[PDB]
Amino acid sequence: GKGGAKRHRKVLRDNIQGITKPAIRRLARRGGVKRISGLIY
DNA sequence: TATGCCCAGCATCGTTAATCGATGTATATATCTGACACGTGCCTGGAGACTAGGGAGTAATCCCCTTGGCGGTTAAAACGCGGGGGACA
Numbered sequence A: 001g002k003g004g005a006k007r008h009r010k011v012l013r014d015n016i017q018g019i020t021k022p023a024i025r026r027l028a029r030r031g032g033v034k035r036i037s038g039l040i041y
Numbered sequence B: 001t002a003t004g005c006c007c008a009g010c011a012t013c014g015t016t017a018a019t020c021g022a023t024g025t026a027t028a029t030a031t032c033t034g035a036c037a038c039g040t041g042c043c044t045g046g047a048g049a050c051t052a053g054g055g056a057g058t059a060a061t062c063c064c065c066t067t068g069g070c071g072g073t074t075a076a077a078a079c080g081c082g083g084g085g086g087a088c089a
Helices: A021-031
Strands: none
Touching: none
């Protein structure tokens, strides 16, 4: 349970976590559906 | 004359043996078809050989384009909350 010279570096440009979820919904409505499931996207 | 007694007489039942015919099983032979390999014959579409030429290889230079680093705002992604209306039975 220590500071231990901790350095934090994780990867969120390329990797799919990093990309933006609204970026998708932005996409979803152009099609014009009313609803987005969590599972689906 | 009628009623019990002697002497044949074919069909009743069963059992033995020979015979025509059906069923099962080899066993070497005469068709049936379907070939794949060979030689028959011929064509030339490939092989073989040579040339000539221009594509593509490489090498030597250039300079443009792509990646990088950085920092400021400023929108966007992210989160959550809440409740309605669509999914699903």
